Amino acid sequence: SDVYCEVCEFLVKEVTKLIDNNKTEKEILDAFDKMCSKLPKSLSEECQEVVDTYGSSILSILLEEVSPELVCSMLHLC
Amino acid sequence: AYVSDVYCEVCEFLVKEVTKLIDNNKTEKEILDAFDKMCSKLPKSLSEECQEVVDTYGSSILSILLEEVSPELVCSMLHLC
């Protein structure tokens, strides 16, 4: 059914721009660092550092690679 | 070269963590409300079928999306691997 495939593709694309907001990027980045406080000491002064340094870039790039057509195919909508 | 393996590995770890962190109750609810709002903006025909799809498959679109994220591919595109 081409209509359910279409709707599914709209849905997947909609998720992609919703995580893409800066409000979500901050929530996620803030919620990390906390994961790091579950450590040291030395391995929490380099966990925060690395989250800070690479995190923004990792987040926007993982969104870019999302295949709507693939998500929807593994649901059997497309 | 060994330092490059470290860079690549840290990037991959981050991709897996972040991926886990996105899958939470707040974010899932924001997605559902946005799905609902979006369906109601479509033409009558399509808005109803849009909602049917959200009702059955909506709450697991995020999980399949997160499952398809490739840490290696994200990090190669960053030139970290």
CATH number at residue A47: 1.10.225.10
CB pairs under 8 A between A and B: 96
For residue B67, give the chain A residue with the closest CA: A71
Return the amino acid letter for A4.
Y
Domain with A34, as residue range(s), is 1-78
B61 closest CB neighbour out of A11, A28, A50: A11
Question: CB within 8 A of B73, min separation 6: which ones?
Answer: A65
**Nearest in space to B27 (alpha carbons), one of B16, B15, B35, B37:** B35
In a 3-state reduction of DSSP, which class is residue B29?
helix
**Structural domains in chain B (count):** 1
Residue with tokens 């993982």: A62
CA distance A10 to B57: 13
CA distance A17 to A24: 10
CA distances from B15 to A10, A71, B24, B66 (A): 25, 19, 16, 10
Identify how the structure was determined: X-ray
- Residues in chain A whose Cβ is within 8 Å of chain B: 3-4, 7-8, 10-12, 14-15, 18-19, 24, 27-28, 31-32, 35, 50-51, 54-55, 57-59, 61-62, 65-67, 70-71, 74-75, 77
* DSSP class per residue in B24-51: SHHHHHHHHHHHHHHHHTS-HHHHHHHH
CA distance A24 to A27: 5
